[PDB]
Amino acid sequence: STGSATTTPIDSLDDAYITPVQIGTPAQTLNLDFDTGSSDLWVFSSETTASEVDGQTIYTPSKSTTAKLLSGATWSISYGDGSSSSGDVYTDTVSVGGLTVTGQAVESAKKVSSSFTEDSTIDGLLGLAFSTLNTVSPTQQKTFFDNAKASLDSPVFTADLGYHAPGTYNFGFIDTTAYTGSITYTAVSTKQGFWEWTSTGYAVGSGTFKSTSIDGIADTGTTLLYLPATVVSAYWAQVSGAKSSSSVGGYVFPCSATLPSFTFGVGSARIVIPGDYIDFGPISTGSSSCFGGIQSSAGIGINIFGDVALKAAFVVFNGATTPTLGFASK
């Protein structure tokens, strides 16, 4: 089997991407944030505290003939940005882009933090990291990908995120028309439950490539590119007037600037992030200070190849017995 679904930016900054997902019978379609940095599929629901729902589409398990309470199971998750959610669990039929999993754990939110309430465009998350990170207790549950894997033509999914445009998540096949050149594969460590890999270095603009190992995660659920302070300082030093602002919470730059590109290494291959991808616009409406898309990972504890980086590539998440990651230009 295979699946193919379009993923669409939630706003003009590509802050996140939503993908329609069919849950239950008859189908209830919710727009979920596919997150390769976590491993819970959770939704706004008829159980979510009413004051914490503001415009989201909810899953109502009582209206699904295939929903079953997973008795005694609860979940609770906290994300890197400080947001959180928690609740109980149903199993139900879940389909993405024509690919159907029966018996999928659908985590129903009883509580969500303010960041989720305030984002009316995201109806929940669909985790695509390794199932060892799943938060359901006392019986840990599998991700949609883990459940689908055995049925897939090939044990892979791909992320093809757009810059200010829709893109695609495919399951079970590699679309050889969706990228240019060849795909370069690189080793993955699953020790922390993430799609963790080591970049071979970087360049700023037209500068020389610096060969250096940068361990980090491929995380579709993180907006920006978070790298070591040394790397980030070298990038912003090439932008006149750029500075790190503790009051704003990172590097800012004059909105009048033209940003240089940023290149990262994948083995001997190179992925180029155009300068425009690194512009996240005014810090507040009407400001001439703009927020940078490359930020320091210092104090996160991990480097994160978020959407800024991933959208510059066609990315293969290979979930074979020995997992790997592939990157191609596009």
Curated annotation (Swiss-Prot):
Catalytic activity: Hydrolysis of proteins with specificity similar to that of pepsin A, prefers hydrophobic residues at P1 and P1', but does not cleave 14-Ala-|-Leu-15 in the B chain of insulin or Z-Glu-Tyr. Clots milk
Intrachain disulfide bonds: 255-290
EC number per UniProt: 3.4.23.22
A GO MF label: aspartic-type endopeptidase activity
Residues in Peptidase A1 domain copies: 17-328
Keywords, in A-Z order: Aspartyl protease, Disulfide bond, Hydrolase, Protease, Signal, Zymogen
Taxonomy, superkingdom: Eukaryota
GO biological processes: proteolysis
Active-site residues (renumbered): 35, 199
Family, similarity comment: Belongs to the peptidase A1 family.
Protein name: Endothiapepsin
Organism, as annotated: Cryphonectria parasitica
Taxonomic path: Eukaryota, Fungi, Dikarya, Ascomycota, Pezizomycotina
